[PDB]
Amino acid sequence: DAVPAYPFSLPHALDLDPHYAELRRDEPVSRVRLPYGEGTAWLVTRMSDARIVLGDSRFSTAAATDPATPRMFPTPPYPDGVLAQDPPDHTRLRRLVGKAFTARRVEEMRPRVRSLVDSLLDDMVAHGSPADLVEFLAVPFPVAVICELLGVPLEDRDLFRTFSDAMLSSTRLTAAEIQRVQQDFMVYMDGLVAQRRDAPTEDLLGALALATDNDDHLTKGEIVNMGVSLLIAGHETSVNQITNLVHLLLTERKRYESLVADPALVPAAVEEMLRYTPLVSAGSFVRVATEDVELSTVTVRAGEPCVVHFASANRDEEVFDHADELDFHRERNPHIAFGHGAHHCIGAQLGRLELQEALSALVRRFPTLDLAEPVAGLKWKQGMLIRGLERQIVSW
Ligand code: HEM
Ligand SMILES: CC[C@H]1OC(=O)[C@H](C)[C@@H](O)[C@H](C)[C@@H](O)[C@@H](C)C[C@@H](C)C(=O)[C@H](C)[C@@H](O)[C@H]1C
């Protein structure tokens, strides 16, 4: 049609396309053509609409498994995936692993997690300035945590990192490359679960194995694919967000300075930068209206698909004052960096904990921390549904 292509542009660093501000003011629900599937979808750019699309049972993610449905990513959605489940099947699927992810149990991890951080910043003072924060902190820290929590051997890091990168592909890989990797990841994760048949374990793969035999409502696909989801998300998010928050802090170095000063403002600064950063480069897993639903400016009809831009909802000038600006002293922060509704991030407390502990340590032990490579040459990941840096050389 004359419906525009979404994404609107190749992304630049952590910058928002300014069409998002235009769309927010004048056309906050707009028709867009997603890179894969057939047809058109409504793009949702404002906080109130995002909350309805993410929040209401009249929007179904399961309805989007149809290969004809528009989507951000080459492969048609895996039907046994958590994102493709609607409540109440979705609620039952999430109860299998949720206990592990409540703010209470995630708090219980802060000791082990801080020790791990210290050990790795130790190995980085040993190598000496300048060093690559990616090599020494951003990758090994979240990989260690999700490995211990799930029960995944650390010796498999290169294996699951390669699979995980492939499956967050936007334009870098083809549908058939990604379905291939998906099959391998399923068989590998099925393999690890099966090892707990006559040898149960006190870890989440432990729980996923007991479910295969003790639970009659959940298919083995769903249970095993859950293992894949936690292992992908459990390193892919935090690894990129550490590089992203650091990039935000050391470019306008006033922010890092201001945290060196008051290191107890780090929990608030993490929430503010979570609001400010497009971790999800563009759009979202799609929701299809199953009934007419009224958004701000339009009634989406049954069968019409919708896609949200999280980073755009988190720049809504009707919700956050001075949104175009990072403020660590904000009174309220009702951001949706972790989504909303049924599919609200399960790992949100873990990712909060890992971002909190990484930035605390750095601000406290490295007050001299600065970018020891040019901003113009920064190797931002290309052709993936998420943003982050491949390398971040820092001096102290
Ligand atoms: C800074 C860290 C993180 C951010 C910004 C983040 C962001 C998000 C967002 C926006 C969603 C919603 C997707 C949607 O509804 O379309 C989500 C879902 C999810 N996140 Fe996170 N996440 C983070 C950390 C983690 C961690 C540490 C894990 C696992 C250990 C994880 C696992 C998941 C899973 C499995 C889902 C899908 C949940 C469902 O479909 O019910 N995330 N995350
Ligand atoms: C369109 C962008 C989205 O990607 C997708 O839907 C991907 C195809 C999913 O299969 C990815 C690989 C799953 O592992 C998720 C469980 C990862 C978790 C972090 C998210 O939900 C994430 C926010 C995700 O929704 C977005 C990146």
Residue numbers in the entry: 12 to 407
Sentences from the paper on this structure:
The 8.8a-oleandolide epoxygenase OleP, from Streptomyces antibioticus, is the P450 involved in the polyketide biosynthesis of the antibiotic oleandomycin. It introduces an epoxide function to the C8-C8a of the macrolactone ring of two structurally different intermediates, namely the aglycone 8.8a-oleandolide (DEO) and the C3-mono-glycosylated L-olivosyl-8.8a-deoxyoleandolide (L-O-DEO). Substrate binding to the cytochrome P450 OleP is coupled to a large open-to-closed transition that remodels the active site, minimizing its exposure to the external solvent. When the aglycone substrate binds, a small empty cavity is formed between the I and G helices, the BC loop, and the substrate itself, where solvent molecules accumulate mediating substrate-enzyme interactions.
